[PDB]
Design a protein around this ligand. Structure first.
Ligand code: SF4
Ligand code: SF4
Ligand code: SF4
Ligand code: SF4
Ligand code: FES
Ligand SMILES: [Mg+2]
Ligand SMILES: [Zn+2]
Lengths: 96, 54, 115, 86, 690, 125, 117, 208, 48
């Protein structure tokens, strides 16, 4: 999700962009500013919400021992979704 | 490695499955294990001669 | 009493004699150092630097400290005479590439926070 | 020449500060109501000695020792300070 | 005398009766594992981690709640004690979440460290864990309840220390949870301490989240300047940046806590800072310039005028060094118009006697009084730690508290006499029942707040309060050295200014409007340009952009309290010093250094060049400012009363009203906390829940 | 035999330290305060000596934290306050000493939680 | 098991694996890793700075052992010589680009060794 | 207790204790303490004046015969009045045993050179002088061994900074390598790792 | 990889790049964090 700045400089996922006044932009002359193209926030926002039939669900990130430590998520709040603190995947209970 | 998680790190599956293993992995990779006070001179037969550590 | 043991000297007089002997040796050596190392300084500059190095710790009143200082001076003289030292080591005594650091309050206030 | 402030540094329980303590306990109030617009700052010293400070115009000041002085002596020197002498 | 003998691992210890096993063990340097026991809170006994074996006793005892008995032999390192510790740690870790890499507690966690030191190294739990839902208790304390170990430390702190009963437990057994059972923000002036007391990552700081690890931080020990309590703190820094503020234990003062403004307003320092010298250009706009140019302009305008024309005002966060330097500089110009924004009555003794304007009893002395009278004060917001000490004495010593003023909520029950100041005269004349109550009290205390001395009739009020203290000292005699008379300050720079001879108030400026004004961190808005003649030269020295900066002609950037070694004087009269944690940003400098450099430019150079020389000057002017923990001083109440009873100005028919009536007006009071985004969030949260 | 010196110990000329980092430094002799996040007290047993904090600035490249004073990380450990004072004095550094802070003993009573007439009674457990 | 140029990895959804625990920074024997972090706009625990000085690194592989989510790895690449010193001071963008570039091989290498770990 | 715990040899422990008692009996003029560690290492604490007699006895006695100097080094403990601890590690080929001899000194008190007793000691003493500043009397040729020519200070002392006081670079104006005060692009980051909870009860100190 | 293809991911590069050191595409390092201290902005209107 790269957007350009008024000076034409690409904006990183962290949000750092040099100001017009700043002299440090000279380091990119005749060269390029390295920016990763895959914003992880937009990618994780694209994942669908899982629906499960229990008050507590477990997430390990997938792949067993190739994921993150296994944690358990409470799903009692009806007007929200439980989010894994490692992976960012969302879970909920079937409503309406 | 010695089956003592307060010295040797546990396996990755254990660290990702059980609470004690994760705590011990965290502490061994951030602070490290404490060694009791004392002094030793240990020497081996290295290929170039006697190699020692005080 | 304070029950202390010496290194070489018993009181300050013997220590001063050793200091004078070391000063004589360095003063004699300076011209040979200028010749061998191909220094662009004069012999007068070298002897002034030797005198300044000696005066840098003229306030010492402990004979043991003076004894150790003389031992270190002899070590440095041995390094210079045998050419273990290089031209860069000899010229480090003069600080030729260091910009002067002002000592009054106003300049220190202008440049930074250091006292 | 123009006095601006008076400072007295007396210690809490030193034997030498006994006279200044007695003076403050007895005759300070009279002096204060005699000079209702003069700062007389009472402060506490550490174990060194008692003292009295007098400040004049343009930042000039000098100090006089009050060690072992009695109340009469400190009153004397204080009223010498509050007049154009010494 | 009545000491008994007990043995800890075969070593004889003599202890007072009622001493617990844990205390007997720590008498010889052995710290027992604990999770629910806090030495400043009620004993709970719930965690069970403190279980130890007593010799010849089949059952282990809870060291935190069991009184030692004569001849007992505690065995802190026996097999039974170690096995009890291992079992309890196993039960604690069974349902705990694998959250250490995402937990802010990681690296400074009691659960982690005690698992490493007293528990096993592996798990045999083969079931699924529980997970509870999270709670919202405000914008300050982050809540992740799954990590809770049910210590109940937060509930006890809220009930006993903060006086707020909003925290509790619902349900039973495994399902039991800690919270409020409804959506309700736990908002208190001391609320942020539950983060410190919570041993796990269940309660954490929300402004601090995810920003640092404990092994990274460098610790600097300094003093808090957000009020006149002078709480001891630790500044955590990493790579030249302030990361957070932590309490530092000082038994006489704060003890183990800090107020929420002390803890969370540090973010204020980051924004709206003066970093370069500024002057006015042709268009009347402020423009960046060098130090030399601004100093030259100020020196020229200082040489241009003399005596009464030159004036200065000191703000609420100024240190002693800068105050004495500015006083000396203005004295060289033959000026005495050195003033502070906070007003103290000048009638009679005034600032001449140190006892007249100080809290004589002291913070630790509150624990000995049995009757305290508060007049025109809101201690909870003005001095939250002083109010906490009052509540501690109310809870543990049955202290009787009465208030004169508007009925604020103080978190404890007090007796309300009224708000009309006529009650002061009724008590003084003996025509009040509370006069009889004070007459019979062995160790009475009367506390008058500095916020009630801000009124026009404030000087009369001081005399009335003094009359009450004289009546108490007369009828009840002399209890020795009790110092019934007290004054409670709310500004960190006030007492040091008073010690230095600075004129209290600001009326001298109004009666003699100057042409050259010095604003040393003065952001109270007491004097605008209406009160001054036109084309007047105004110089502002500070660290923030606030009320006083846009009205000035020259701006000199100074250092905040985290960026210098400075001297501050407490309300009690104790003098404490800060330490440099991070250097001042940009071109900002130390304040006394700025004043000394300006004096050199102006030609009237000051004698002192280093900080030690400035502190020698401070010793010359007032020797109590270099005694860095001393709080004992002579008492001159009798002379002050004599000099105060000669002027008889009348009171005012206006009920005493504290400046901060409610919690919302507590958060933003000074320059730093006005620039804090966390304080703005707190104000928004208290004015609307949502 | 012995020589019986009667001077004061001063080794500054032998340590090789530059003159700036001897006269302008101020060390602090103190026992570190307990980290308020933990209940353990094992880090408040020894005395510590550290130097005054100097300037740190941002590196133009990479934005790292730069320093120019060599003593920014030096921390010493001593058994007693007198040992630290002696070390600082013989090394020529000026110092400030802070007296050790100890938590005062407290009177704990589990029965006070349920008092008949006192305010110590607790509403909840 | 070969230890090469470093990389930062993602979950299959594209979300980053790194959670700013700073274990790799703590364990690094050369102090070659510098990390800063803050809550992301959606509340996630993510870094804002992740720098590795490759002229400080000893290529010991301790960082990838310490990582609890396999976020930082030493990838198989070893042909990355540069013409200037500054090209070897990696920031977060460079490491993420390396991860996206070498994931196809890194995942296969991890699949072949994780049972020994 | 069986699989993960290192085994302890009682017979060796008894022999080393008896030999320590033997050495202490033979040289009461210099021996201040004799200790045997639980992992079977014997230490002998002596007065500095007994460096030469003790080492000579341990080298030449028929029942000792520690003819090889394995290692000689120093340890700096700033909290002690005598700052420096001198450690000799000796190995006996005849009896297949090792021994450790310890003494102490401060900045201004020389220690006698042990070069006459052991040829190997000449370099070790030079390293001790270079790294710690301990002077050895009657050394054949005492001078710096490890540090750069003209280097000032002793870097192994606790007070000495890790990165030193000066750095080196090449300067084109003077066309040589120059030394200047250290400036670091990234400051070394200090870590506070020690746990606030005690680890080893067997080593707890009395509360003074 | 013909017999054993790698796993397909949406973020893996579809175009391999070689060593670009010494070219205009070379990597240039920079700080990825935002400003720490915000300065005070003086008012744009006169004061008298
Ligand atoms: S509070 Fe729990 S999750 Fe957090 S570090 Fe401690 S043990 Fe780990
Ligand atoms: S939130 Fe913290 S203090 Fe409160 S019960 Fe849970 S663990 Fe204990
Ligand atoms: S491989 Fe080793 S030296 Fe290199 S970054 Fe990882 S931990 Fe540090
Ligand atoms: S790379 Fe791994 S170890 Fe390093 S901070 Fe990120 S999650 Fe922690
Ligand atoms: S500390 Fe005693 S039961 Fe919790
Ligand atoms: Mg907590
Ligand atoms: Zn997940």
């Amino acid at each position: 999700g790269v957007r350009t700045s008024p000076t034409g400089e690409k904006v990183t996922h962290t949000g750092q962009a040099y100001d017009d006044g700043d002299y440090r932009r000279v380091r990119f002359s005749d060269r390029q500013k390295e920016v990763n193209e895959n914003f992880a926030i937009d990618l994780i926002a694209e994942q669908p919400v899982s629906e499960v039939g229990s008050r507590v669900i477990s997430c390990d990130g997938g792949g067993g021992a190739l994921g993150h430590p296994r944690v358990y998520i409470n799903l009692d709040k009806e007007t929200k979704t439980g989010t894994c603190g490692y992976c960012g995947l969302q879970f909920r209970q079937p409503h309406h | 490695k010695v089956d003592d998680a307060k010295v040797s790190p546990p396996k990755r599956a254990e660290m990702k499955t059980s609470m004690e293993s994760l705590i011990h992995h965290f502490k061994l990779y951030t602070e490290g294990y404490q060694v009791p006070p004392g002094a030793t001179y240990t020497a081996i037969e290295a290929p170039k001669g006697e190699f020692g550590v005080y | 009493g304070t029950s202390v043991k010496p290194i070489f000297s018993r009181d300050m007089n013997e220590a001063k004699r050793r200091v004078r002997e070391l000063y004589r040796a360095w003063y004699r050596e300076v011209p040979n150092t200028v010749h061998l190392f191909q220094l662009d300084i004069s012999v007068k500059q070298g002897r002034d630097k030797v005198r300044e190095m000696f005066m840098k710790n003229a306030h010492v009143t402990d004979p043991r400290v003076v004894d150790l200082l003389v031992i270190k001076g002899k070590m440095e003289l041995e390094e210079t005479i045998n050419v273990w030292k290089q031209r860069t080591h000899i010229m480090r005594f003069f600080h030729e590439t260091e910009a002067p650091r002002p000592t009054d309050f106003l300049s220190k206030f202008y440049v930074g926070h250091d006292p | 020449l123009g006095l601006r402030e008076i400072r007295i540094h007396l210690c809490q329980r030193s034997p030498g500060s006994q006279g200044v303590r007695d003076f403050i306990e007895k005759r300070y109030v009279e002096l204060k109501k005699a000079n209702p617009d003069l700062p007389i700052l009472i402060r506490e010293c550490s174990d060194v000695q008692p003292k009295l400070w007098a400040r004049y115009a343009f930042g000039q000041e000098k100090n006089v020792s009050l060690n072992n002085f009695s109340a009469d002596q400190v009153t004397r020197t204080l009223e010498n300070v509050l007049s154009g002498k010494a | 005398s009545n000491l008994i003998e007990v043995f800890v691992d075969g070593q004889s210890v003599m202890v007072e009766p009622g001493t617990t096993v844990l205390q007997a063990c720590e008498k010889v340097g052995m710290q027992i594992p604990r999770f629910c026991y806090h030495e400043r809170l009620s004993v709970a006994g719930n965690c069970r981690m403190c279980l130890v074996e007593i010799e010849k006793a089949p059952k282990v005892v809870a060291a935190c709640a069991m009184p030692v008995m004569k001849g007992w032999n505690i065995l802190t390192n026996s097999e039974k004690s170690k096995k009890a510790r291992e079992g309890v740690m196993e039960f604690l870790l069974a349902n705990h979440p694998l959250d250490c890499p995402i937990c802010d507690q990681g690296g400074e966690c009691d659960l982690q460290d005690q698992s490493m030191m007293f528990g096993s190294d592996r798990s045999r739990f083969l079931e699924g864990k529980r997970a509870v839902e999270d709670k919202n208790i405000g914008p300050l304390v982050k809540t992740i309840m799954t990590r809770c170990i049910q210590c109940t430390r937060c509930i006890r702190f809220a009930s006993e220390i903060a006086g707020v009963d909003d925290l509790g437990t619902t349900g039973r057994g495994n399902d039991m949870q800690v919270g409020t059972y409804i959506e309700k923000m736990f908002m208190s002036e001391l609320s942020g301490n539950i983060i410190d007391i919570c041993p796990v990552g269940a309660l954490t700081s929300k402004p601090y989240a995810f920003t640092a690890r404990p092994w990274e931080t460098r610790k600097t020990e300094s003093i808090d300047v957000m009020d006149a309590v002078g709480s001891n703190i630790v500044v955590s820094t990493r790579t030249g940046e302030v990361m957070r503020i932590l309490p530092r234990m000082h038994e006489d003062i704060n003890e183990e806590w800090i107020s929420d403004k002390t803890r969370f307003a540090y973010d204020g320092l980051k924004r709206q800072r003066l970093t370069q010298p500024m002057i006015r250009n042709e268009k009347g706009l402020l423009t960046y310039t060098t130090w030399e140019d601004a100093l030259s302009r100020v020196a020229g305008m200082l040489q241009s005028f003399q005596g009464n024309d030159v004036a200065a005002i000191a703000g609420g966060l100024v240190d002693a060094e800068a105050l004495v330097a500015l006083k000396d500089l203005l004295n060289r110009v033959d000026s005495d118009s050195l003033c502070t924004e906070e007003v103290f009555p000048t009638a009679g003794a005034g600032t001449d006697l140190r006892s007249n304007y100080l809290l004589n009893t002291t913070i630790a002395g509150v624990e000995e009084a049995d009757v305290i009278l508060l007049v025109g004060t809101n201690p909870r917001f003005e001095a939250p730690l002083f109010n906490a000490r009052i509540r501690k004495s109310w809870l543990h010593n049955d202290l009787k508290v009465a208030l004169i003023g508007s009925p604020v909520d103080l978190t404890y029950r007090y007796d309300h006499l009224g708000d009309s100041p006529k009650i002061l005269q009724d008590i003084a004349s003996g025509n009040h029942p509370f006069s009889q109550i004070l007459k019979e009290a062995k160790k009475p205390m009367v506390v008058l707040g500095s916020s009630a001395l801000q009124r026009s009739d404030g000087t009369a009020i001081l005399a009335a309060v003094s009359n009450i203290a004289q009546n108490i000292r007369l009828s009840s005699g002399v209890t020795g050295d009790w110092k019934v008379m007290n004054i409670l300050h709310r500004i960190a720079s006030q007492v040091a200014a008073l010690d230095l001879g600075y004129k209290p108030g600001v009326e001298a400026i109004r009666k003699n409007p100057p042409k050259v004004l010095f604003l040393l961190g003065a952001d109270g808005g007491c004097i605008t340009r209406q009160d001054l003649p036109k084309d007047c030269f105004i110089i502002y020295q500070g660290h923030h952009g606030d009320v006083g900066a846009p009205m000035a002609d020259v701006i000199l950037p100074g250092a905040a309290y985290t960026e210098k070694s400075a001297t501050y004087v407490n309300t009690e009269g104790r003098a404490q010093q800060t330490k440099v944690a991070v250097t001042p940003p940009g071109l900002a400098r130390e304040d006394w250094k700025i004043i000394r450099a300006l004096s050199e430019i102006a030609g009237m150079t000051l004698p002192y060049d280093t900080l030690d020389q400035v502190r020698s000057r401070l010793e010359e002017v007032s020797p109590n400012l270099v005694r860095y923990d001393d709080v004992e001083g002579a008492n001159y109440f009798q002379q002050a009363n004599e000099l105060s009873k000669l002027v008889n100005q009348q009171l005012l028919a206006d009920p005493l009203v504290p400046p901060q009536l409610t919690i919302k007006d507590f958060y933003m009071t000074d320059s730093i906390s006005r620039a804090s985004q966390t304080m703005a969030k707190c104000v928004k949260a208290v004015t609307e829940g949502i | 035999q012995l020589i019986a010196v009667d001077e004061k110990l001063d080794i500054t000329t032998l340590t090789g330290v530059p003159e700036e980092h001897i006269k302008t430094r101020k060390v602090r002799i103190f026992v570190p305060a307990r980290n308020n996040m933990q209940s353990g007290v094992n880090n408040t047993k020894k005395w510590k000596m550290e130097f005054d904090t100097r300037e740190r600035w941002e590196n133009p490249l990479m934005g790292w934290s730069s320093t120019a004073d060599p003593l920014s990380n030096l921390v010493l450990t001593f058994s007693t306050k007198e040992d630290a004072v002696a070390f600082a004095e013989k090394n020529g550094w000026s110092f400030d000493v802070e007296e050790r802070k100890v938590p005062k003993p407290k009177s704990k009573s589990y029965g006070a939680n349920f008092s008949w007439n006192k305010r110590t009674r607790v509403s909840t457990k | 098991r070969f230890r090469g140029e470093h990389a930062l990895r993602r979950y299959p959804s594209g979300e980053e694996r790194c959670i700013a625990c700073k274990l790799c920074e703590a364990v690094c024997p050369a102090q070659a890793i510098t990390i800063e972090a803050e809550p992301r706009a959606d509340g996630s625990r993510r870094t804002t700075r992740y720098d590795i000085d490759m002229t400080k690194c000893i290529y010991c592989g301790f960082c990838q052992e310490a990582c609890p989510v396999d976020a930082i790895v030493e990838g198989p690449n070893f042909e990355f010589s540069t013409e200037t010193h500054e090209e070897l001071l990696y920031n977060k963008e460079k490491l993420l680009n390396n991860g996206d570039k070498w994931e196809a091989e890194i995942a296969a290498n991890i699949q072949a060794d994780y049972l020994y770990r | 207790t069986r699989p993960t715990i290192r085994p302890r040899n009682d017979v060796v422990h008894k022999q080393l204790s008896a030999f320590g008692q033997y050495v202490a009996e033979i040289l009461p003029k210099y021996v201040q303490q004799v200790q045997v560690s639980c992992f079977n290492e014997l230490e002998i604490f002596i007065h500095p004046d007994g460096v030469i007699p003790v080492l000579t006895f341990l080298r030449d006695h028929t029942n000792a015969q520690f003819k090889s100097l394995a290692d000689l080094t120093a340890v700096d403990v700033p909290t002690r009045q005598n700052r420096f601890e001198i450690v000799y590690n000796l190995l006996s080929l005849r009896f297949n045993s090792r021994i450790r001899v310890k003494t102490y000194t401060d900045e201004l008190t020389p220690i006698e050179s042990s070069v006459t007793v052991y040829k190997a000691a000449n370099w070790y003493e030079r390293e001790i002088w270079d790294m710690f500043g301990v002077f050895f009397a009657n050394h054949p040729d005492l001078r710096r061994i490890l540090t750069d020519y003209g280097f000032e200070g002793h870097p192994f002392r606790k007070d000495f900074p890790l990165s030193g006081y000066v750095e080196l670079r090449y300067d084109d104006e003077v066309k040589r390598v120059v030394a200047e005060p250290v400036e670091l692009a990234q400051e070394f980051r200090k870590f506070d790792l020690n746990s606030p909870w005690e680890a080893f009860p067997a080593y707890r100190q009395p509360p003074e | 990889p013909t017999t054993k293809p790698p796993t397909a991911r949406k973020y893996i590069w579809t175009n391999h790049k070689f060593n670009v050191s010494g070219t205009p595409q070379q990597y240039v390092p920079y700080s990825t964090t935002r400003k720490k201290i915000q300065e005070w902005v003086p008012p744009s209107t006169p004061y008298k």
